Amino acid sequence: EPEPQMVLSPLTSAAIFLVVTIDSGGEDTVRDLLSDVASLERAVGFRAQPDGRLSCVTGIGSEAWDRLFSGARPAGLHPFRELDGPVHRAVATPGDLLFHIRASRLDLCFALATEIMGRLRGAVTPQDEVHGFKYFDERDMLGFVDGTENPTGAAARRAVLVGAEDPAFAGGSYAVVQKYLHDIDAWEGLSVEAQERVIGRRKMTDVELSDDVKPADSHVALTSVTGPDGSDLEILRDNMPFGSVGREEFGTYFIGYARTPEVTETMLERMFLGTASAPHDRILDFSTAVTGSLFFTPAADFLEDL
Amino acid sequence: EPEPQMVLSPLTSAAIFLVVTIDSGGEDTVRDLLSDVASLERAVGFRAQPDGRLSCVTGIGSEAWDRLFSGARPAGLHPFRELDGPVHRAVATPGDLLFHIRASRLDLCFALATEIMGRLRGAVTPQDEVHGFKYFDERDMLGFVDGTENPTGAAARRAVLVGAEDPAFAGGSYAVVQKYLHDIDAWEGLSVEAQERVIGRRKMTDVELSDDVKPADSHVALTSVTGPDGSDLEILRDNMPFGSVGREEFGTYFIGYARTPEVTETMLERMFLGTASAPHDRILDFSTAVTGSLFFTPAADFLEDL
Amino acid sequence: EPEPQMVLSPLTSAAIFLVVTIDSGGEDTVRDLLSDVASLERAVGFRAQPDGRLSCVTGIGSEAWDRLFSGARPAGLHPFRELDGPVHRAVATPGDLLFHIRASRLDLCFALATEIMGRLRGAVTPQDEVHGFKYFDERDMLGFVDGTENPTGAAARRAVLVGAEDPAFAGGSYAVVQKYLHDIDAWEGLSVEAQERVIGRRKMTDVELSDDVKPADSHVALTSVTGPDGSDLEILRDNMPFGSVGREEFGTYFIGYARTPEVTETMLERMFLGTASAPHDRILDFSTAVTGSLFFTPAADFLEDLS
Amino acid sequence: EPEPQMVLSPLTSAAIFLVVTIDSGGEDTVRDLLSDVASLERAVGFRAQPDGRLSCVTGIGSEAWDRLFSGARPAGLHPFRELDGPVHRAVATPGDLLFHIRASRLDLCFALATEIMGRLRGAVTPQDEVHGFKYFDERDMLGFVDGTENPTGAAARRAVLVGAEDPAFAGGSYAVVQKYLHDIDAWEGLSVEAQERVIGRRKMTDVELSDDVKPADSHVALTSVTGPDGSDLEILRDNMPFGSVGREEFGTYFIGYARTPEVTETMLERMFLGTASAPHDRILDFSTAVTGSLFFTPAADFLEDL
Amino acid sequence: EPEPQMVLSPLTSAAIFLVVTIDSGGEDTVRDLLSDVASLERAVGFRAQPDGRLSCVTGIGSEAWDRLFSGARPAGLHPFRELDGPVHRAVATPGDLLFHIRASRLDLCFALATEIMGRLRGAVTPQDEVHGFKYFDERDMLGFVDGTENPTGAAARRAVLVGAEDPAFAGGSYAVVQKYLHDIDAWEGLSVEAQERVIGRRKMTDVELSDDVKPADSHVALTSVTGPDGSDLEILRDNMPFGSVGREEFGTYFIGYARTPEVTETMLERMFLGTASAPHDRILDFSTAVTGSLFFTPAADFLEDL
Amino acid sequence: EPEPQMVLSPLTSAAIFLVVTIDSGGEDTVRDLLSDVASLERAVGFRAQPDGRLSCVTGIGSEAWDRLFSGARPAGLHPFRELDGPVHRAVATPGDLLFHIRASRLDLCFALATEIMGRLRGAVTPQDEVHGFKYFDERDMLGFVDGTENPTGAAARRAVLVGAEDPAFAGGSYAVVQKYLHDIDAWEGLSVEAQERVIGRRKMTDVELSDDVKPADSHVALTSVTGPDGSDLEILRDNMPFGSVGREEFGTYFIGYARTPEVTETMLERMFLGTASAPHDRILDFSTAVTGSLFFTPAADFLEDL
Ligand code: HEM
Ligand code: HEM
Ligand code: HEM
Ligand code: HEM
């Protein structure tokens, strides 16, 4: 019955990520923006309804939920954990509102972001405004196909949508965002076989490496987590490449939706802290998480009732 | 006989404007890059040939030409003139190499720019990188359709391509680049009729205003320059919007190609210094020029012979 | 009977509205066509099936229903009410059968209409035939974006499809059709701010005006109807621009699908008769309704299995 | 060289034909419009530049040419000849101005026609306008593929544009406009083989019938005129299906461009009056001409220089 | 609840049919491929996600089911019946594994087939490989529109998906595959009306012939089977044209999905053996069946759990 | 003045290569087909001409020219020269007529080939028929991008169209066709760096290797022929991947157009016989030539005058 936000939509060719902090006394402005965001998205996106698939997902951080709403907090909504392994660390950056805008053209995303920021001209403060674009075969900046094993259909619904465990917030999701900056020089220093061993998949054919050859510290092996029931826990992640050529900045904005934050937290702990058979993820040797945050994206019905 | 660059192409949806300055001792690397920029463009763009429309235009500033080539300089190639008008001024900023990359997708432009700057590591210091996107209705940040009256066909090449006036540099062109930052807050405070009077075109229908009603200080009226023999002086403009909603940065990157810089300089003088019947252009009351430069784009044959 | 006649399909770029009336003795061939309309639509559309998205919706008027079928009538399905306000009027032109054809290309719609009328030749009288096309940003003849606030997903299904209130006719809908001829000269005589105040949304960015500034007599304000339980009533509408510049004729064909006709009747009454705080809709000052009719679009299986 | 109009354009999905008669005293309005038709077309069609492919062609009748322009007349521009055949006839209807608008979507053509008629309010009387649409395989309403043997490339330029025979009007063309109402019942009453014999080509594969079995009175055979020197005489046709289902009106709007009207006049005479081996064209047994006119489409610079 | 193998996917423009026979001792490799086929399809098809629509359907023959799996068998699974009609005979050919690959481009299908065969190298013998391409308007080699009356929506699910009748194998389907070679010259010898009477539909308009004129031995009149309870028995068919001009070979590869094989068996018996009012199907006079097999396509969950 | 036979057309997604041998006494039928091939191509293509891009190129072998035409012969026409290298051989196969059909869909190519072969039924013997498909990323079966360095525009016209050196046959070209079978099993055993060194270009980004480190026996370094006057000899080649997974056949059909066969013969001699610094091309260690022929594709007007 509850209507989830557009989190199950397929990834498009253009996206904008807005991580924004809320200034003191701007709670009412944020409330009315959350009420009107669906109408704003519809108005901006209907001008190109046949093609463009404009979709805005709004999430609220743990530190802002108790300041905006006086009801019951969603279960598991907590500030992003600080993971500091022996070598790499995951830093948590301030963030209260997440606006994830996706469309086939950057113009629609820019217009929607402009409208949203205009409605919040003097009540908030931007933190991590980022534009992201796709490549030829949906590749990332590391040259590998990204998001191949994303759950689809009913599997995605079971993986990312909150069910009867939190009846008051059915249809919501937990989104973990993390901006990484790559080291392209070191990555290009390695051979293609070394890159495949680091990732765990073939670079050209995208065929997953055989289990008897896949290294224990590869990114794919460490992110493959199986729960107590024997089924593999999965999340609907949508990485977006980004960067500026002049500043020699290349990176990836990872966003991951789940029905509970525990799956993403376990994946991050395995990647950073490492398992018994692997000190840490190999992909972290060439990628540093410059920012990280956690948000809760509620159902559209909850947002429309403010 | 000479082969001009891709300066005569339809305005694509995505573009990257790179302006860089050559450091000391980097002339040899710049020459090496210019000797194979066409090959790099072909290699990057052939991967998506039918849908993609990748095209890179390379231009050399007046300062860089003396230190790069020992031959005769192109006629009219001079450092960008700075106009100190009574109210507005056109600032001239350093720049020695311009790469104007255009494609239907931002990924191709980003890959080409990455390859170029990787070839130019250490040799040049980046000065201005702009990622321009084109709206669904190829409108400006002011909401007006841009490039409607661009010359096309034989008129375009007769207006932008150097002919027999400079036989040694036939097929080249002069490109004036200028970055404008718009004051959207003040622009939105004007009625649609006021905006149309400022621009000189109808906002929705894009129909030019009548001669008896068009204001003398409108942008279209001031940029319409008649030649000494009754002909109309024309330039090719590929200005595109750009900006980021995080910093309240909304702007337009203007690039203009001509046979000689005299036409563009006259248009700029009319816009900034004004006319006897108009103190200055009205569009400058809402746009501020923060970067201006002039470059010469030679024929592909000239670049391939280095 | 869960089988709607594709009335939830998104708006396409080309459409044909065909309202006809059946003369005496034509009740037999019309029945034969109604059992073949789906097959004809499939046969015409499958050629362009990858992107043709051809869809035909058939509706039966109040008189035509009890003229053709001898079963129980659907709840409602009254002849279209004629509203005669202090200034504007809503005429109720005769109409028995409505064919709403939608496709990305006009050729598919024209072929389907040609086949339908060839099967119907000699037994119907064409009351109205309108070819509608879509502008750039789904604009209407007034220059505003049309259909922005259309319900989508499960909300549209709950808003247009008949539920358990009429179990015998589940999956159907009630379609109200009207033809408006705009006064383009008067509309262009107004400033853009005046046009936005008349409509209720910004012309450029399609963002609707704030509550404290939106006029009480604007079209959007008057068509925003709140139900007795606080839930706003919604309908699915596909307004198609049409006209010919030779006759200086410009207009919009409005079609509205609802679960019950009462919602559309209330919206029309508020637009024409007006409320206490607004004499009538402002958009009616530049639009004149030349036709008007109400039809019931039954479920696909009901048309296939006549009774 | 003179710049030709948009006559040399490919067949397009949507078209509008607008034939009007200039009222008394409305010469000045038409004259000032003709200098603005190119600007109006550019303004309207630029909004959909990548795919709109909007193009407007303007033609002037003989009486309209006499009333408007006081210069020399083109070699053609005689009032459309009315052929009184033994069975069929080609009526000549009044017409002074022809606007042929072509675009991929009918909205562009409608907007351009609206602009033109608004500029022509109170000065012209619309004789008739036709909204033409293309079927699946560019077919006509008779079920056959239309325009298969149209000239292309330099051959079309030689057979359409006016050359050195009339140097003062180089780049123009002569357009013959006719409106045919088909008898679909009689056409459908014929077998497919009979229809192919009527037309002269196979309906299925669209291949031409072999010359030993093609009937002498077939449409293809009769409109295959051989020049005095043995060179084939050809014209460019852009037939547009049209009709209204409610009125049971089905028909084709034929427009034919030539470098001289005599080619189209000879084709029409062969079709209607017939040859020695054929009383008349067979396709005329199912098509009735209800509107005929002849116009001259001048070069773009001629219209601009007014 | 169980997820099918996307047997309800819309018809695409390119397909590959691969029928192979498992060699002795190759059961383990076949099981591994059946486990990894979903991952292989996801990896190959993700490179072109928006377009392409790559989908692979895997079916196991009756002779191979008892060799690969143990414990239970589908109720309807059995070796394909051979029909020895008075004139036409439907031959049964050895087939153990069926791979039906569909995509908008043949390259994706070829890559998927290459991966599958490489995984199966040394374990299976390729009995048949067919590359089918969609014709002009979904026509077949006979020129008639193919697939017009396929069930869609919930009707297709009720017609092709196994329900509560076989709970252990819910979500599966039964696929009957045949390869017909056409006598194109003899078919073209017939008139268009004769062809329509043989098929039962209009050649151009695809309108079904009236019941008063439709021949009793036409293809449509013979494949229209009414159920015992007055319902209509329906199957999902994807007929793919194929052939080579060098060998003068043209044909259609027919695949039919059903919830039970009884419907397809009844249709084949009516087509070949014929009813009381028709000796056999008329289309069989111009088509010869050179291949026939029956396979069971289980739910994706069953294939994954191996 | 002469019209080229659509040789300069851009590469499409689907192609059909037909090589046939004229039987004794079938010269008249071949002449009739050569006369009617343009009409057949137009008739087949105009159904999908908005985006079909169908184009048929016809070439006549050296032996067939002496039989079909009794006039003068093109200077460069001669039977294909078989090269017997130390380890590799270029076999010459009997081929009299070449039909190279290109279109965005295999449907148009198959229809055109069917019509052509039907007109040639009983007159020619089909020696070879290849259905070539083009990968999603313009790659070949070796995983590298093909045709990156193909000449375009004026350079291509100068390089592939014969001019004043043979005025009687101006507008024609010489096409060399070869059928290659690849050893994918051995090719995949090499590292990506080894594959790049064999080819001579980067596999990922298609960037040509630097002048140093580039092997002297690489394919690119061996097909880069410098003319006597310091210019680079270039040909327009359209390699098409092809094969079947059932027979484990993978290969590339190479077709190369030139203004004279000397350039292609020199390239083949360098690849097979080898230079002083390279025994032979490395790519030949994984590709075997099973077919080789040379044809002369004349101008369209030459074929239309039969
Ligand atoms: C710079 C950071 C990252 C990059 C470039 C990256 C890229 C990739 C790539 C190329 C793959 C293989 C392709 C595919 O499976 O679709 C993959 C797999 C995956 N990654 Fe990431 N990833 C990053 C960070 C993360 C993080 C932070 C998480 C979780 C917290 C994550 C979770 C996963 C999962 C669940 C899979 C699929 C595992 C499987 O298929 O068994 N990734 N990633
Ligand atoms: C006569 C000419 C009409 C025109 C040009 C027109 C056009 C429009 C436009 C531009 C809007 C605002 C944009 C949008 O909501 O998508 C709108 C809103 C709407 N109109 Fe109309 N309309 C017309 C007549 C009608 C009629 C006759 C009805 C009902 C009987 C109706 C019902 C509505 C509704 C329900 C809305 C939604 C407003 C909201 O959800 O806040 N309109 N219409
Ligand atoms: C009145 C209804 C007409 C219809 C339905 C029609 C349609 C056709 C068709 C289907 C063809 C064969 C396919 C093709 O050539 O593309 C054709 C050929 C042709 N028609 Fe028409 N046409 C009509 C009138 C005319 C008129 C009035 C003229 C000239 C005054 C004309 C001139 C030609 C020419 C020149 C050809 C090509 C001849 C050739 O290829 O040798 N047609 N027409
Ligand atoms: C037999 C299998 C062949 C394959 C797979 C193949 C593929 C390639 C590839 C990948 C390239 C580099 C990328 C590109 O130029 O687009 C290339 C270059 C080239 N190849 Fe081939 N080729 C083959 C045979 C031939 C033959 C037989 C010839 C001539 C008789 C030839 C002539 C050329 C030429 C002229 C170039 C351009 C190199 C340059 O301009 O620097 N190739 N080929």
Side-chain angles (χ1 to χ4, degrees), chain F residues 153-156 159-164:
Chain F
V160 307
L161 290 179
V162 65

PDB file of all heavy atoms in Angstrom, chain F residues 153-164, unseen atoms left out:
ATOM      1  N   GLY F 153      36.191  11.864 -45.976  1.00  0.00           N
ATOM      2  CA  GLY F 153      35.990  13.100 -46.717  1.00  0.00           C
ATOM      3  C   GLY F 153      36.865  13.184 -47.952  1.00  0.00           C
ATOM      4  O   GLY F 153      36.952  12.244 -48.750  1.00  0.00           O
ATOM      5  N   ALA F 154      37.515  14.340 -48.117  1.00  0.00           N
ATOM      6  CA  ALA F 154      38.316  14.586 -49.312  1.00  0.00           C
ATOM      7  C   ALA F 154      39.490  13.620 -49.405  1.00  0.00           C
ATOM      8  O   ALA F 154      39.835  13.157 -50.497  1.00  0.00           O
ATOM      9  CB  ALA F 154      38.808  16.032 -49.324  1.00  0.00           C
ATOM     10  N   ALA F 155      40.126  13.316 -48.271  1.00  0.00           N
ATOM     11  CA  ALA F 155      41.230  12.364 -48.283  1.00  0.00           C
ATOM     12  C   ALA F 155      40.766  10.990 -48.746  1.00  0.00           C
ATOM     13  O   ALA F 155      41.430  10.345 -49.565  1.00  0.00           O
ATOM     14  CB  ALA F 155      41.866  12.277 -46.897  1.00  0.00           C
ATOM     15  N   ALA F 156      39.617  10.533 -48.245  1.00  0.00           N
ATOM     16  CA  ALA F 156      39.084   9.246 -48.677  1.00  0.00           C
ATOM     17  C   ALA F 156      38.740   9.262 -50.160  1.00  0.00           C
ATOM     18  O   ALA F 156      39.034   8.302 -50.883  1.00  0.00           O
ATOM     19  CB  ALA F 156      37.856   8.881 -47.845  1.00  0.00           C
ATOM     20  N   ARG F 157      38.121  10.347 -50.632  1.00  0.00           N
ATOM     21  CA  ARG F 157      37.776  10.442 -52.047  1.00  0.00           C
ATOM     22  C   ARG F 157      39.022  10.396 -52.920  1.00  0.00           C
ATOM     23  O   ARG F 157      39.030   9.749 -53.973  1.00  0.00           O
ATOM     24  CB  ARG F 157      36.985  11.723 -52.311  1.00  0.00           C
ATOM     25  CG  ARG F 157      35.485  11.514 -52.438  1.00  0.00           C
ATOM     26  N   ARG F 158      40.086  11.079 -52.498  1.00  0.00           N
ATOM     27  CA  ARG F 158      41.335  11.047 -53.250  1.00  0.00           C
ATOM     28  C   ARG F 158      42.002   9.679 -53.175  1.00  0.00           C
ATOM     29  O   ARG F 158      42.702   9.282 -54.112  1.00  0.00           O
ATOM     30  CB  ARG F 158      42.281  12.130 -52.731  1.00  0.00           C
ATOM     31  CG  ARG F 158      43.553  12.296 -53.543  1.00  0.00           C
ATOM     32  CD  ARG F 158      44.437  13.387 -52.962  1.00  0.00           C
ATOM     33  N   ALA F 159      41.795   8.948 -52.082  1.00  0.00           N
ATOM     34  CA  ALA F 159      42.508   7.694 -51.873  1.00  0.00           C
ATOM     35  C   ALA F 159      41.821   6.483 -52.487  1.00  0.00           C
ATOM     36  O   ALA F 159      42.500   5.498 -52.798  1.00  0.00           O
ATOM     37  CB  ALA F 159      42.710   7.450 -50.375  1.00  0.00           C
ATOM     38  N   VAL F 160      40.503   6.512 -52.671  1.00  0.00           N
ATOM     39  CA  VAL F 160      39.786   5.326 -53.126  1.00  0.00           C
ATOM     40  C   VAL F 160      39.168   5.482 -54.511  1.00  0.00           C
ATOM     41  O   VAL F 160      38.834   4.464 -55.134  1.00  0.00           O
ATOM     42  CB  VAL F 160      38.702   4.900 -52.115  1.00  0.00           C
ATOM     43  CG1 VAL F 160      39.304   4.746 -50.732  1.00  0.00           C
ATOM     44  CG2 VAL F 160      37.544   5.879 -52.118  1.00  0.00           C
ATOM     45  N   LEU F 161      39.004   6.701 -55.015  1.00  0.00           N
ATOM     46  CA  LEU F 161      38.355   6.926 -56.300  1.00  0.00           C
ATOM     47  C   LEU F 161      39.414   7.166 -57.367  1.00  0.00           C
ATOM     48  O   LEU F 161      40.255   8.060 -57.224  1.00  0.00           O
ATOM     49  CB  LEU F 161      37.389   8.107 -56.225  1.00  0.00           C
ATOM     50  CG  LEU F 161      36.121   7.883 -55.402  1.00  0.00           C
ATOM     51  CD1 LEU F 161      35.270   9.141 -55.381  1.00  0.00           C
ATOM     52  CD2 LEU F 161      35.330   6.708 -55.946  1.00  0.00           C
ATOM     53  N   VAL F 162      39.369   6.368 -58.435  1.00  0.00           N
ATOM     54  CA  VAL F 162      40.300   6.540 -59.540  1.00  0.00           C
ATOM     55  C   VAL F 162      39.944   7.801 -60.318  1.00  0.00           C
ATOM     56  O   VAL F 162      38.766   8.094 -60.566  1.00  0.00           O
ATOM     57  CB  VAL F 162      40.305   5.288 -60.437  1.00  0.00           C
ATOM     58  CG1 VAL F 162      38.957   5.092 -61.106  1.00  0.00           C
ATOM     59  CG2 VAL F 162      41.408   5.381 -61.475  1.00  0.00           C
ATOM     60  N   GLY F 163      40.964   8.574 -60.679  1.00  0.00           N
ATOM     61  CA  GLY F 163      40.740   9.853 -61.323  1.00  0.00           C
ATOM     62  C   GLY F 163      41.299   9.964 -62.725  1.00  0.00           C
ATOM     63  O   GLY F 163      40.956   9.170 -63.606  1.00  0.00           O
ATOM     64  N   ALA F 164      42.167  10.953 -62.942  1.00  0.00           N
ATOM     65  CA  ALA F 164      42.685  11.243 -64.272  1.00  0.00           C
ATOM     66  C   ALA F 164      43.638  10.176 -64.793  1.00  0.00           C
ATOM     67  O   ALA F 164      43.921  10.164 -65.996  1.00  0.00           O
ATOM     68  CB  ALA F 164      43.385  12.602 -64.276  1.00  0.00           C
TER      69      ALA F 164
END
